[PDB]
Amino acid sequence: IYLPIANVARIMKNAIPQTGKIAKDAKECVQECVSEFISFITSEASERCHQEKRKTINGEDILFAMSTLGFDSYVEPLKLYLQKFRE
Template sequence: MAHLPRLVPAIRIATSQPLPTPEQPVISEYDIGEYREQDRFLPIANISRIMKAAVPSSTKIGKDAKECVQECVSEFISFISSEAAERSLNEKRKTIGGEDILYAMSNLGFDNYAEVLKIYLAKHREHQSTMSSARAGQYQGDPGADEL
């Protein structure tokens, strides 16, 4: 994760003249095609399912719209992950945890989402704890139950 570049949102300023930009390599149609080819292997079914749940059942969603949302989601995940990775690296840890993601989201201005996710993370951990306790109780209560 340490090799991920830190992404910073670009600020557009309306001026009569375009701002000078550093010389960037020209992206050809071949590069775009190659990028899209790699994109095909990522699962788009989850994105499609979420999008369909958010619109009326009579609405159709085009493939290009699904791909666009998938690219946005991938960029958002990279943005948050790189900030979380930077925090864990500064604290000399190799694993990014839920708190790192929450910190990254708050630090990057997504406070509203971070608050909701904080509640979700607490409920998720509580559920995990309950499930592991139930499993431990099941194994202690009837040691031969697994053999069925």
């Protein structure tokens, strides 16, 4: 299961020169990596959730996992995004 290739490709295209190109195989590779990223973080968030005596993995569980697994730089941007999403 992957995020739509078109969505992935659009973000990829915005990160390279206007005339740069991306091989189909590379888009599929990033698709694979994104799902692996979500699974990696989710596994740790699930453990955290369980240790906190809960069953529904929440935002704090996800952010704890990101900070614990080496993605702490994602935390502040994510908090701002979620705040704007729900305001």
